[PDB]
Design a protein around this ligand. Sequence first.
Ligand SMILES: N#C[C@@H](Cc1ccc(O)cc1)c1ccc(O)cc1Cl
Ligand SMILES: N#C[C@@H](Cc1ccc(O)cc1)c1ccc(O)cc1Cl
Lengths: 11, 10, 219, 225
Amino acid sequence: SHKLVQLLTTT
Amino acid sequence: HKLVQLLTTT
Amino acid sequence: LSPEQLVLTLLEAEPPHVLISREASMMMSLTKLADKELVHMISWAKKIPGFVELSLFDQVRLLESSWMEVLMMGLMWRSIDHPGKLIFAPDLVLDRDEGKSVEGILEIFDMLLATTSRFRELKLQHKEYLCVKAMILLNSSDSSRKLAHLLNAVTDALVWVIAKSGISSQQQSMRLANLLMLLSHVRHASNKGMEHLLNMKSKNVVPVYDLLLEMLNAH
Amino acid sequence: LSPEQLVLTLLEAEPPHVLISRPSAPFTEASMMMSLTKLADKELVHMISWAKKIPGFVELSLFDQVRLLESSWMEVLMMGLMWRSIDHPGKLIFAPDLVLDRDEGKSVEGILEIFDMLLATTSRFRELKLQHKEYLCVKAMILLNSSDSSRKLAHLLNAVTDALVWVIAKSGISSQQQSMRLANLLMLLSHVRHASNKGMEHLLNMKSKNVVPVYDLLLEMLNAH
Ligand SMILES: N#C[C@@H](Cc1ccc(O)cc1)c1ccc(O)cc1Cl
Ligand SMILES: N#C[C@@H](Cc1ccc(O)cc1)c1ccc(O)cc1Cl
């Protein structure tokens, strides 16, 4: 899972 | 032991 | 950006008050809190001028490094006025008596309470808190030059904050040294809590929630 | 007493250079671990003697002198290495005849990681142009900051901090530049401290593997972790 990058790249 | 001795006996 | 405006930038980045909305249950409540706070920590970092101008590898690495020290720095500021209290959340206040209920915690609660007391004694200001929390993120192990410039501007902001207290030149330097020497104490606590959490995950005794699991695994 | 006098005291207090010969053979797991632990053990002895020569150190509780030294020893070893290694880029000057390239790290599982941090931190010290009198004050601050004896420790830590501030001001840079320099030096404390933790875990692991030797003092100081 990649939720750090998901949240880093969106709002 | 050795730390305490070096701190106090030396 | 004037150091004043950087600090307002940081003021404006502050994450909201988080609530856990109600032994095993203490630990379950700390992990569940850690997961919610990590969500808000990500938005917080994104709002530090220039953080989003760093490489995504840099952004990922600085948050993976620093997250527990940033959770703990926040805990100490929320705990600063409440000696004997670790103010995890409004619906989660713990003393070291509760700390006792789970092997390895009391040691951690003690380090956090000691360090907190050190900041209470120094009367840590809010604006000092904001600068040092950011410093913890930026100072954790081209984009290399952008990060040096970002860390150097938050360092600059903390020296200004201190300049504004009005104390003597000598006393500012001594105040700056005393706040910064406390960072290796936060990093000490951080290392201990992460060790305890890795051990807790390894045994599968608490739910190591999604964003939290990813963040622990990085270490 | 005065900051200058504290610095002059610390200067005199510097331990002597410990001499270790490189193994005749190219390095093995065993010969590299044997060389670095022999050196650590001999340096720990001189450390305790150096600590006793810090004004007010011996006025502390015996049990605080033990806790500070158990807490900071690896960090203090590592700051000494980085200062020995600062006039010799790429190299780690563990001893006059025990100079190691990041390369020879190869010879022990995981010690290449450690050598990198050590070279990276050393680099930042070289970029900051860390001075001798600064190094003296910073090494002292690492021992005193590694946390009525508690009232006396606080006062001793502020005296070395006062000394560093005095050294930096002797440079004549603006006040704002003194603050920045003091900040940049100190923010490295956490980096040294990181290198110490990884280094201690590593040593604890190598001891588990049967690789470590029998050294009373070093084993003693590692068991307080
Ligand atoms: N103490 C503690 C927490 C981490 C933490 C620190 C600051 C916060 O604001 C929120 C949480 C902990 C310690 C051991 C452990 O196994 C798990 C957890 Cl979550
Ligand atoms: N690097 C290194 C050494 C420690 C050291 C550092 C500075 C000195 O002046 C002397 C020794 C080490 C690293 C890992 C390990 O498992 C064992 C050892 Cl001895």
